Design an enzyme around this catalytic site. Structure first.
Site, short mmCIF file in Angstrom:
data_model
loop_
_atom_site.label_atom_id
_atom_site.label_comp_id
_atom_site.label_asym_id
_atom_site.label_seq_id
_atom_site.Cartn_x
_atom_site.Cartn_y
_atom_site.Cartn_z
N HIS A 19 11.47 -44.35 11.74
CA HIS A 19 11.03 -43.01 12.12
C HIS A 19 9.52 -42.82 11.99
O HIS A 19 9.04 -41.69 12.13
CB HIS A 19 11.77 -41.95 11.30
N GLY A 25 5.68 -38.69 2.43
CA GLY A 25 4.94 -39.92 2.53
C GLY A 25 5.46 -41.06 1.67
O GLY A 25 4.84 -42.13 1.65
N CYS A 80 8.31 -42.59 2.15
CA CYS A 80 9.18 -43.47 2.93
C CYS A 80 8.56 -44.85 3.04
O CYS A 80 7.34 -45.01 3.11
CB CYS A 80 9.43 -42.88 4.32
#
EC number: 3.4.19.12
Lengths: 5, 306, 306, 5
Positions: free
Chosen positions: C41, C143, C145
């Protein structure tokens, strides 16, 4: 009682 | 979101751990620049640890009596010196992985991360808090001495603890990196007792703020209280007195949550007098006091959950 | 002695974290050899995250659309590929700090350490357990991820988790390093609910053994029970059924403590039916289920406290 | 409800 590491 | 007991990344400390052997005694050392720091009882044996005179034992040793191993590489000790309760071994090689570092002595109630090492090899990392009686509740086995506690400011490692021994109650004691013990403890195997422990009140309040930032609000109430009336209840429950400076430190958390510090103290007073009645706060059934306001801000300010 | 939630040293994982930027989206990536792994993503923006067709979005990008930063060094993407829910970015440079590693998919009830990173820079490490509903109770902000979960066998890093999102209940979901989600979750911002969670019974028993190894014995009793009569009470309290294989896994802890597994189950049954009556076990007021028998053995077998 | 990191 206290044990040195 | 979420809240966990979080330790600092240990990569910059892992590169400084060495194994120090003197005779049949082996423990961990901290290799910074061309100096290796380790607990001074590495020069003792089983018959010495009851009441050793460390200056007598050290003058009977020379540089060749200390075998320092950094992985498979052996470092030659070119000089030794006792600094209080730690040994300072000058070695032939400067550690190329030496980070920017400082030697700081922390205060009771402050936290730090512990890199538990065995035979110069790190095996685990976890967060610890210095109790008001200058003990820590860690996890240390035989051979874990020389394990260091640290905080990471930005890129600078702030070394604050070196492990030395375990007290009969299961708690642990050590020194700062200058060899000065935390608390009234000495590096000898005698009957030693820590002072009566207390709960760090400012840490509990910061932890309650972390719960509100994460959406645990069942303990909040309409009440408020004066600082003195809260300190009267805190004394009865073995809590440290809350000062005006503690309220100022909780300021940022007070502004982000919209809950005044004295309003949160009124909630803590009810939690102390009534308990939790079977409920939990951030997954815990008792009041946690091992999270500083800094630890909460570093983990929760990117949240709102209003 | 002592018992703490202990994470593995993160040094070998710290050297593999990079920052991956695609447009205005920035997250963390895992740089192993000449491949960078990151959540897919990263190719989305705010208007895509409701229901994105990732294959449509990926075919509209090329290698120049991915900016990979390893500290101050920029890596040129020479190839890209989608593997389920993770992106595989081939880069011009093989990571010189690449440790020996494996890609494993863990089971519910097993644990692992989480290195929370932001903008390719690690900021904290903590231990996590995969819940029976394939969620984890971590601490992740915006942030985070690309943060990876891992175990360290000996010198080999077993990567088992990559963070992807947070569920409305505050729990977190992700994939293994092959892009396959843990549980019935999808990488899109829709209403998703985790299944009903349960307590990992074998972990609670191993944690009770850790208490006995550390000298918390107030919960022990003379009673014993059959495995079936224990599983009848475990079902009523939302505990997983205890199998004969679980008893075999608790074997080493049973031998070291001299307490049969079914004797410890009788103690757990009383703790479930009666509670703790205000007492604590290893400093906790509820029953912990995030310690595997391996986690206990690794921390407590160098103790006796008989 | 689910929020991507």
């Amino acid at each position: 009682x206290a044990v040195l590491x | 979101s979420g809240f966990r007991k979080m330790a600092f990344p240990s990569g910059k400390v892992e590169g400084c751990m060495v194994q120090v052997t003197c005779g049949t005694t082996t423990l961990n050392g901290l290799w910074l620049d061309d100096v290796v720091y380790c607990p001074r009882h590495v020069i003792c044996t089983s018959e010495d640890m009851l009441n050793p005179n460390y200056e007598d034992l050290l003058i009977r040793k020379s540089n060749h009596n200390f075998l320092v191993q950094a992985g498979n590489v052996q470092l030659r000790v070119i000089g030794h010196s006792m600094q209080n309760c730690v040994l300072k071994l000058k070695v032939d090689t400067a550690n190329p992985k030496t980070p920017k570092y400082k030697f700081v002595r922390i205060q009771p109630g402050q936290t730090f991360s512990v890199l538990a090492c065995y035979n110069g090899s790190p095996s685990g990392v976890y967060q610890c808090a210095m109790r008001p009686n200058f003990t820590i509740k860690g996890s240390f086995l035989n051979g874990s001495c020389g394990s260091v506690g640290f905080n990471i400011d930005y890129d600078c490692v702030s070394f604050c603890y070196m492990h030395h021994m375990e007290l009969p109650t299961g708690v642990h004691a050590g020194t700062d990196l200058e060899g000065n013990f935390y608390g009234p403890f000495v590096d000898r195997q005698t009957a030693q007792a820590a002072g009566t422990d207390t709960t760090i009140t400012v840490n509990v309040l910061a932890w309650l703020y972390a719960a509100v930032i994460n959406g645990d609000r069942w303990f909040l109430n309409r009440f408020t209280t004066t600082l003195n009336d809260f300190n009267l209840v805190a004394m009865k429950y073995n809590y440290e007195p809350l000062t005006q400076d503690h309220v100022d430190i909780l300021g940022p958390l007070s502004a982000q949550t919209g809950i005044a510090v004295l309003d949160m103290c009124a909630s803590l007073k009810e939690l102390l007098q009534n308990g939790m009645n079977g409920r939990t706060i951030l997954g815990s059934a008792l009041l946690e006091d091992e999270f500083t306001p800094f630890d909460v801000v570093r983990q929760c300010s990117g949240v709102t959950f209003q």
